[PDB]
Write a protein that binds this DNA or RNA. Structure first.
Length: 62
DNA sequence: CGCTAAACGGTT
DNA sequence: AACCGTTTAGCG
């Protein structure tokens, strides 16, 4: 049983990208604080940051 | 299709 | 526990 695909709001995407520009890796507390501010689950933030690092590494390589 | 969220098996 | 590298798949 797969989880439904989260559709992030524009506010959530803007805040996630502002976080990522500041810090490429978050502490457990910072990750939880971001999830709470955005009404997202801890896992959805953790997964967004992980996939964001994948995209970031792709862009670094060119 | 392209982007990207979630899942897999493996690593740190 | 979280991450990595990669895959799988949802959807505009």
């Amino acid at each position: 049983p797969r989880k439904a695909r989260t559709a992030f709001s524009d506010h959530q995407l803007n805040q996630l990208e502002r976080s990522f520009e500041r810090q490429k890796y978050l502490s457990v507390q910072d990750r939880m604080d971001l999830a709470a501010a955005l009404n997202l689950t801890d896992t959805q933030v953790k997964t967004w940051y992980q996939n964001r690092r994948t995209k970031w590494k792709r862009q670094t390589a060119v």
